[PDB]
Structure 1
Amino acid sequence: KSHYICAGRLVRILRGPRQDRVGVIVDIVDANRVLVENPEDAKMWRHVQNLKNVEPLKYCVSVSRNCSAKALKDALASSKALEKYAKTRTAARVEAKKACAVSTDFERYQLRVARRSRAHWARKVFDEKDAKTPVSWHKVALKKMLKKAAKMDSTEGAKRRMQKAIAAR
């Protein structure tokens, strides 16, 4: 179910100078505008936001329309919505995007070796497992031909060709 636009609903700003910041709806003007405010964010004083620029979140604090600044702060702290939000995956991704944006050439190198190291060990684990139960194209095809090859290579004529041409090496 989608999260409704209501008083106390937490939102994330989509675009603009407040992009990726979290606020509380506090009040609804009309079908197009709300009055977002977040006490814990410095740039998130009470202001008007277009509803096309907000993304409702799964958290709604219990405040009335046009609630006092103190009441919103107490409700925000008591509900622990910000603490709960910070533990989600999307919140972590937003922090990750900011880290990459301000990253240096050295940190970009560190991420490159970290991803390459994980890629190398994923292959090591995958190949070890593929040896036991074949799942890739080469191991499944090899299993598909081992039974036929063993039957055909066990003939007396094949064994004569085995040694007569191995010895030449």
Structure 2
Amino acid sequence: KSHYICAGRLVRILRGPRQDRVGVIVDIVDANRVLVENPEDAKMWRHVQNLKNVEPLKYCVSVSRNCSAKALKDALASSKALEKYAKTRTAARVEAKKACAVSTDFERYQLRVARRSRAHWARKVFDEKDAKTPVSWHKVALKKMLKKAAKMDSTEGAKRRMQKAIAAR
């Protein structure tokens, strides 16, 4: 289910100068604004954020409205919300986006060969499995044609044509 905007809710900033940073709701002003703060982020001191610019995460620390900086820091460290968030796939995707954004031409080359290497080995593994259990279009077509072909070739006339036109080759 969706995550509510509550005191202690962890959020990610969608757009603006703090894009892709995490904070704590800490307080609610009205239907449109909140007071976000994160002690562990340098640029995430207590400030006002519009609710349209925040993405509510799944973690809620136990704090009261308009809590002190020390109370927030202790609750954050105790709850382990940031450590739990770091292990999820969305956090990894966010970090990887920064890596791509600051990547050089050499790093782009390294990713390209790494992805192509995985692509090559995926093709190898797929071919090995597809030989045994036909799942591709060509292997399925071959497996359906094989039974009729063997029957059509096991005749005397088929043998004569095969042998004559092969020995000619």
TM over 0.5: yes
Name the CA distance, whole Å, in 1 between partners of 2:129 and 2:103. Answer: 36
Tell me the CA shift for residue 26 of structure 1.
Answer: 0.2
Post-superposition offset of 1:92? 0.2
Q: Give the Cα separation in 1 of the matches to 2:162 and 2:46.
A: 86
Q: What is the CA-CA distance between 1:114 and the residue it aligns to?
A: 0.1
Residue of structure 2 equivalent to 1:150: 150
Deviation at residue 148 of structure 1 after TM alignment? 0.1
Distance 2:42 2:139 in 1: 58
Residue 139 of structure 1: how far off its partner (Å): 0.1
Taking the aligned partners of 2:18 and 2:128, their CA distance within structure 1 comes to 49
Q: CA deviation at 1:61?
A: 0.1
* Matches of 1:13 and 1:2, distance apart in 2: 17
Q: TM-score, normalised by structure 2?
A: 1.00
- 1:83 is displaced (CA, Å) by 0.1
Query: Secondary structure at the residue paired with 2:6?
Result: coil
CA deviations on 1:102-159 (whole Å, 9 max, x unpaired) are 0000000000000000000000000000000000000000000000000000000000
Q: What percent identity do the matched residue pairs reach?
A: 100
Runs (5+) with no aligned partner, structure 1: none
Q: Quote the Cα distance in structure 2 between the aligned partners of 1:114 and 1:141.
A: 33
Residue 74 (1) aligns with residue 96 (2): no
Report how far residue 32 of structure 1 moved: 0.1
Q: Secondary structure, in 3 states, of the residue corresponding to 1:55?
A: strand
* Structure 2: distance between partners of 1:160 and 1:69: 93
SS of match in other structure, 2:38: coil
- Look up the SS of the partner of 1:56 in the other structure: strand
**Structure 1 position 8, deviation (Å):** 0.2
Counterparts of 2:16 and 2:86 in 1: how far apart (Å)?
Answer: 21
Shift of 1:24: 0.1
1:54-79 per-position Cα deviation (integer Å, ceiling 9, x unaligned):
00000000000000000000000000
After superposition, what is the alpha-carbon deviation per residue over 1:16-36, rounded to whole angstroms, capped at 9, x for unaligned? Answer: 000000000000000000000
Count of residues in correspondence between the two structures = 169
RMSD: 0.2
